[PDB]
Structures are given as structure tokens and as C-alpha cells.
Design an enzyme around this catalytic site. Sequence first.
Site, PDB file in Angstrom:
ATOM      1  N   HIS A 150       6.874 -55.918  49.930  1.00 13.77           N
ATOM      2  CA  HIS A 150       6.977 -54.467  49.877  1.00 13.77           C
ATOM      3  C   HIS A 150       7.588 -54.107  48.523  1.00 13.77           C
ATOM      4  O   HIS A 150       7.121 -54.625  47.497  1.00 13.77           O
ATOM      5  CB  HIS A 150       7.699 -53.945  51.132  1.00 13.77           C
ATOM      6  CG  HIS A 150       7.713 -52.448  51.214  1.00 13.77           C
ATOM      7  ND1 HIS A 150       8.896 -51.716  51.099  1.00 13.77           N
ATOM      8  CD2 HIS A 150       6.733 -51.529  51.356  1.00 13.77           C
ATOM      9  CE1 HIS A 150       8.625 -50.429  51.176  1.00 13.77           C
ATOM     10  NE2 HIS A 150       7.313 -50.284  51.348  1.00 13.77           N
ATOM     11  N   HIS A 191       1.422 -53.257  46.658  1.00 13.86           N
ATOM     12  CA  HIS A 191       2.871 -53.427  46.436  1.00 13.86           C
ATOM     13  C   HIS A 191       3.242 -54.590  45.557  1.00 13.86           C
ATOM     14  O   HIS A 191       4.401 -54.611  45.125  1.00 13.86           O
ATOM     15  CB  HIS A 191       3.658 -53.557  47.749  1.00 13.86           C
ATOM     16  CG  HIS A 191       3.843 -52.255  48.466  1.00 13.86           C
ATOM     17  ND1 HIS A 191       4.862 -51.413  48.134  1.00 13.86           N
ATOM     18  CD2 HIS A 191       3.193 -51.611  49.461  1.00 13.86           C
ATOM     19  CE1 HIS A 191       4.837 -50.329  48.886  1.00 13.86           C
ATOM     20  NE2 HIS A 191       3.809 -50.403  49.723  1.00 13.86           N
ATOM     21  N   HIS A 212      -3.729 -50.241  50.255  1.00 11.22           N
ATOM     22  CA  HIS A 212      -3.451 -48.887  49.784  1.00 11.22           C
ATOM     23  C   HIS A 212      -2.988 -48.946  48.321  1.00 11.22           C
ATOM     24  O   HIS A 212      -1.783 -48.904  48.040  1.00 11.22           O
ATOM     25  CB  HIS A 212      -2.434 -48.155  50.654  1.00 11.22           C
ATOM     26  CG  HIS A 212      -1.049 -48.587  50.816  1.00 11.22           C
ATOM     27  ND1 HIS A 212      -0.779 -49.762  51.378  1.00 11.22           N
ATOM     28  CD2 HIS A 212       0.234 -48.187  50.630  1.00 11.22           C
ATOM     29  CE1 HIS A 212       0.440 -50.222  51.543  1.00 11.22           C
ATOM     30  NE2 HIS A 212       1.080 -49.173  51.069  1.00 11.22           N
ATOM     31  N   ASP A 320      -2.265 -44.282  53.403  1.00  9.74           N
ATOM     32  CA  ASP A 320      -0.808 -44.328  53.548  1.00  9.74           C
ATOM     33  C   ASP A 320      -0.268 -43.171  54.374  1.00  9.74           C
ATOM     34  O   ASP A 320       0.895 -42.755  54.227  1.00  9.74           O
ATOM     35  CB  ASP A 320      -0.115 -44.356  52.176  1.00  9.74           C
ATOM     36  CG  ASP A 320       1.248 -44.972  52.139  1.00  9.74           C
ATOM     37  OD1 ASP A 320       1.630 -45.781  53.010  1.00  9.74           O
ATOM     38  OD2 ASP A 320       1.981 -44.661  51.163  1.00  9.74           O
TER      39      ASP A 320
HETATM   40 ZN   LIG Z   1       3.489 -48.688  54.452  1.00  6.61          ZN
HETATM   41 ZN   LIG Z   2       3.149 -49.098  51.174  1.00  7.02          ZN
END
Ligand SMILES: [Zn+2]
Ligand SMILES: [Zn+2]
Length: 392
Positions: A150, A191, A212, A320
Site C-alpha cells: 500500500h 501503489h 487502480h 477506487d
Molecule cells: Zn484501496
Molecule cells: Zn489504493
Amino acid sequence: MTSLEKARELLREFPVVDGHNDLPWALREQVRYDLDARDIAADQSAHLHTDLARLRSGGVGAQYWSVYVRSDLPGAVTATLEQIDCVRRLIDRHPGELRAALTAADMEAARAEGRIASLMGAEGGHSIDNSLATLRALYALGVRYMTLTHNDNNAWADSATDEPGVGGLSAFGREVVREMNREGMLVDLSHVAATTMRDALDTSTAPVIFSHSSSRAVCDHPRNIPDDVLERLSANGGMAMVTFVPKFVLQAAVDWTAEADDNMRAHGFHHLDSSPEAMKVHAAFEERVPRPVATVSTVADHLDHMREVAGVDHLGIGGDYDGTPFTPDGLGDVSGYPNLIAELLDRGWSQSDLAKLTWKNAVRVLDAAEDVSRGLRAARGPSNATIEQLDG
Ligand SMILES: [Zn+2]
Ligand SMILES: [Zn+2]
């Protein structure tokens, strides 16, 4: 008909496979999973980007539900299991509208039935606590992608939003990718740092995804994908699922956030400080300088470019939604996708290009991960390696 009308008709035949929605985390944070307090069979527009009626209106036919947990708190594995339990309970409460899906065939079964295929994606390698068996347990429970980081580095992979750590993937990081390949879990490179992207693409024998992320050439944020990486996707066979986050698609929103962050630090605050003191500072900034607003056209600009660099077979969508506080105009919640499809039609995208974008590329990629898995599972057993062993 209008382009909107046409978009709706196209989505009835080939609906959206959305790659990343954080409804489970939002339910955790808002109501600690008391699902009757945010019942999605009701209108939740006051609280959430998502509910069942807006997903239908939006033309969503499959959803990767994110089982995201924070990487700065203890007990990430427990919380991941709680996230997964949240998704399972949602499926069980709404069987008329939702269908659990584990495979590409399940996705097609759902489309045939008119139910929304409900899959899971873990958001960050910290969810496995440096344990390959834990990765295997998450697969067993239904997780079908894992974002390798993340916003923070983990011990074996570097994040886009942190400083350099191991330089991409460590030796253990590569072992995690190989085990994901053997299990049939999709490697998600949203990410992660660009170094991490390239190392994953070197290592992976299955198509990879970005669940995303948008285009770094169009909006320069490290959360977005560089063209050299996009170019490697056709050879890899994977796909980039464009996201709607305004600071990742509008250059002015990136610039605005960077100025906001600077202003916070000039007052002695960490940019993420959410204290009321920090909040008054940010309030004053926003009153001096209004937040720029992205649009459907902003997002379409990303898709045009990604299409030119990566190819139409290597694109998808990942909003998202319930994972980001701000949205583009025309894409304010999960009902908005037809607005984007209509804009693309207006730009000359063909019906088959759009059927790939929404549905077919995602189904292809998951099928390919299953195919790679069949071969590797027949070829060898699962790994018992540890991070100590491979990284020191
Ligand atoms: Zn997320
Ligand atoms: Zn995210």
C-alpha cells in the site's frame, strides 16, 4: 440514440469489471461492520459511493472488493480476515444481486444470471505478514489479487509513496510473486514503486494488473504508471485499470495537493496530520486556493494515452470508489460509468474496444492466471521459504 443511451446498451451486454472498491474498509470505519446500518439494498448516497442500485445504474457486472487493511497498525492479518468476512456477509445478505466469484468462469456465470460477480483483492503485502502459507490461506479464502504494497514499503517491496527501500522487490519479494503465480493470484502493481513494477514484470510468468492506476505521462504522480511499464504490458499480457482519483488524473489537482502539503509543513504539521489544529490550517489554504475539479474528459484522456501505449487489450477500469474522498464531475459515485463510456464513444472508441475495456480483458487476465497456475501446480510443490532465508 444519444451516446449515453448507447453506452447503457453496451454495458448491458458487456458490463464493467471494476478492479478496486474499498466499501469493506468504509463499512469497518463508519459502522464497524454493522451492515444493517449501511444496508446496500437501500440508498446509501449520504454516506457511501456504493450501493446495489447505483451499481446497477452504473453498469457494474463484476467487482473486486478490496480487503485493504492499514499497514501502520498491529494485527493486519486479523483485520484482513475481518475484511474478507465483511465481503462474504455482504454476498450472503444480497444473493439476488451478488454472486461470489473465484474464477473467470464464475464471472461469466454471473453475467449470464444478471448478478454482480463479487471477487476479492488484498491491498498490500503486509496482509500476509511475511508468510507464504498466509498468502496461501488468503487464496483459500477467496482472495484473487494482492497489491504488493500500500502506501508504505514492506520488508520485501517498495511503495510508490515511500522512500526507496529494497530497490523494487527483494529476493523474498520475488518468491512472493512466484508463489502468487503458482496459486493463481494476480499480482497487482498499483501503489508500488516503478522499480517494483519492473522487478515484478521481470519475475512474473502470469499477466499482472494495476487494479487502480492511471498514466504518469498524462498526470505526473508516482501512483501512476510510466510509459516504459505500459509498453511491457502487451508482452506480459496484463492490464492497467484506470482510476478516477482526481489527484492522479488531473495535473492541477496534483499540484494543488502538493501546495497544500507544503503549506501544512510550513505550519509545523505532517501533511497527513488530522488534528483540529492541522485542520484549521488546511481550511485556510482551501479558502485561499479552491480545489481543482477533474471531469470525465480528464479520465478519458488517460485512457486514450494508455490505449496508444499499452494497447486496447491491456486496459480496464478501477474507480477506487469508497477509497478516495474526492471524485471527478460525472463520476461522483458508482452510478457514473456510463458517462465515461459515452465520452469514449464520442471520441470514436469502437464497441469491441469498449467491451474489452469493461469486461473481456479482465476475464482474460484471470483465466490466464488460472492457466499459469495449472502448469506450475503440476510442476512443483508450494514454497516453504522464509524471509530470513532469502533476504537475511
Ligand atoms: Zn484501496
Ligand atoms: Zn489504493
